[PDB]
Amino acid sequence: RTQTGNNTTVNIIISTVDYLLRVQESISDFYWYYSGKDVIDEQGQRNFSKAIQVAKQVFNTLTEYIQGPCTGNQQSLAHSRLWDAVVGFLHVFAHMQMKLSQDSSQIELLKELMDLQKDMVVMLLSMLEGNVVNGTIGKQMVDMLVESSNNVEMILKFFDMFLKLKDLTSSDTFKEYDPDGKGVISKRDFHKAMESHKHYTQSETEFLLSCAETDENETLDYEEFVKRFHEPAKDIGFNVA
């Protein structure tokens, strides 16, 4: 951050947060290109991976910059343009989380995007390490959340829709639809169970039905459907809470 003895000092800690926003402004644009189109092609899926991998590293370097109480580095990212990239990734994490979930071809891309979010939220926790009551970092991070209050809402709804799925899956009202331990049961039976559960609204019901992949017999494994989505939710939503 500050080269003490040198004649000239270059802030690598702020030059690093400058590349993160330049990457973010190239990932949001590449998302906006693909938002209208229904399917993410192979060459547009190979470029999201190759950019999320870079972003996950820029977030790991940034969190290693600040892990351990380093009040010079923690008070330096709080007066930079980090909040403008953290707010911009939250807009991408709130839309491609819903768009990629519906499709079944883009599963690995969703997993990679669901790890970039984790490494960003573990970065956001290192900003509040050694936090104080009424602190500048907390005040500036609350302002970011207020600014992105809609994207965080539509992420928290997505997490809540999947964190309650495990209770329904483990409930006996589902075991009566699926008496044997086969682990697979029909979409019609899923829709009966979700309507009988009465905690999931109609809209959430067709959304979760659409996010379910069908075979020729319309029976998907509910032991992997609740593993592909609940585990990412159980992982990130804890750090968000």
Task: Report which of 113, 95, 100 is spatially closest to residue 211, judged by C-alpha positions.
Answer: 100
CA 219 to chain centre: 28
Joined tokens for residue 46: 């190979």
Q: From the CB of residue 159, how many other CB atoms can be counted at a distance below 10 Å?
A: 19
